[model samples]
Target: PLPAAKVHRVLDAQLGTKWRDRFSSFDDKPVASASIGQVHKGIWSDGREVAVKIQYPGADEALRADLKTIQRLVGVFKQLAPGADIQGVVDELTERTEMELDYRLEADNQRAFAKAYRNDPHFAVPAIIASAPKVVISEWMEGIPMSVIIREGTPEQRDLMGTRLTELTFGAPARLEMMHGDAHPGNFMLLPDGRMGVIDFGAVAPLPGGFPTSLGETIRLARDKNYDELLPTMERAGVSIEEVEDMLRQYVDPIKVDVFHYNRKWLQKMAASQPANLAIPLRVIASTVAICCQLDAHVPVKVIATELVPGFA
Candidate 1:
């Protein structure tokens, strides 16, 4: 939780002493608090309910200190991925964490997503009402948090929800031309009306201009077990291609049926394979790529096409 005193200081600095003028009423108590920020529930001056996310003061310094701690403890990280560049990973982590500290950029990204998915009935991106360097106000959503669903939903619900979540995660790169850098259940909510409400836009990734085309062609080649072309395609994107035939055989080739059942257990099992057999060159890929939060769990499976394509759909 943020000290209400400091939260007030931030609000006053950003919105002046009349910060309450931006909302009909504001709640000093945060409804949710994460490492970088906290969220407060409030109502817009126009009567619409909203969720206000405020970045903690000195969050950048805290994240930097944590990253530095990781760098200094390189021995432990080396044990996890002996062949990976721990220093490069630390640099990338530092870069992205700093990005998360800028609430204005987050608001802009959310606005882009909200506009992109506005016509879709199955997905929801909140409307941005106002924003500042440390603060962002958006639509307040009420629903069963996806994390809760993951923990307690029925089997059918899990399968259905997991399928949709995977679909959104994989399909996002193509649809939005940028991927949601973080796809954890915490950033999602299953609404009463069946649409999935997605929140948090601090982590957005840019897609290569040819990402979709290269991705589709790579999959088509893989479907035919034609590593001859698949190898070169991924190579262009700086992803290594090996053990790819096995990956496709397990994850992609079996998607002959329309409704592919996606379960957490299966995803976990697939990811537990040796990093050497996980397709992408572990050393080269992590430098420029952000792995799917789901796949990043085990081996950072950076198999360009397979990672970007939605096999579940």
Candidate 2:
């Protein structure tokens, strides 16, 4: 975390000398801190509570340097996971990191998500109030973080939160042409009103034509145990069918049932059984399930896919 003095200086430089005039009161101490930035709580001039996210002074340079280091290690990563597209992954990471460094771009992403989910009963996205290259001021959202929920939430609460998480993960692409690429517990909140609040729009995966139909078809085939056609389908998509057969079956197990229960034991069992290469290729899916495991939530995976994913009938 950046020092309070440095934080104030960055805000002043980003928002200019009259920045204080726009806020009735602002806190110097940050309410939350992460690798990229810290969030400060404040009251807007309009009497509205707000959260100000300020990028750390050296985060931009540090991130680029880190990525460069990772780029240098790509040869090692390729040898470890020969079937995976290490170069493509690194390129995408580079692009996403660039986007993440600019708070204005993140603000735009958040605004679009907020507009899409406005008046939504099950989900809430904080509205962006003002933004600059390094700072974003958004409506203050009050809720229990998913980390707390994972520790103290009731079974019912966990199940509901899990259901909402699944909906957001799959529904976003269909509804907004993008998916919340980061599914960690910290990025979600369980609101007092039983809604799920989402924050951090920096890592969205934009699908200009909506979710891929081929992916939907692959899942459908897997659900039907149609290995005859599944292999060819996967091959066409450039996946190593040999390494993926068993992994694909296990990963898609949730979609084979009306409701799938996610827990630490289930995740552990899957992790222990899958080959390292298989896990590497399906890491995103694994990460999503890991979050579900943390929630100990029961999600209706099949129903959600049928409703949201195209060609998943």
RMSD of each: 6.6, 4.1
lDDT of 2 by residue, 1-313 (tens): 6887898799789998678899998988899886588999999999999999999989889999989999999978798899988998789789878888888998888999998899998999998999898999998888988888899999888988888888887788777877777888888998989899999887776666776566778878877778788878777755455456556654587888899999999888776753332233245556777888889999999888889877787
Which ranges of candidate 1 are over 4 A from the true structure?
A: 67-87, 226-242, 272-313
* Tens-place lDDT digits, model 1, residues 1-313: 8888999888888778888887897888899986588999999999999998888888878888888898889867788888988878788788877677778898999998898789687788889998998888899988888667656776554544554455465556567776566655678777777787888888766664414455456567776667777788767744334577655443453344344444346545655666222222222122112222222222212232344553311
Each candidate: what lDDT?
0.66, 0.83
Q: Which pairs of residues clash in candidate 1, taking residues 3 or more apart in a chain or in different chains?
A: none
Give me candidate 2's TM-score against the actual structure. 0.86
Q: Among these predicted structures, which one has the highest TM-score?
A: 2
Error of 2 at 78 (Å): 11
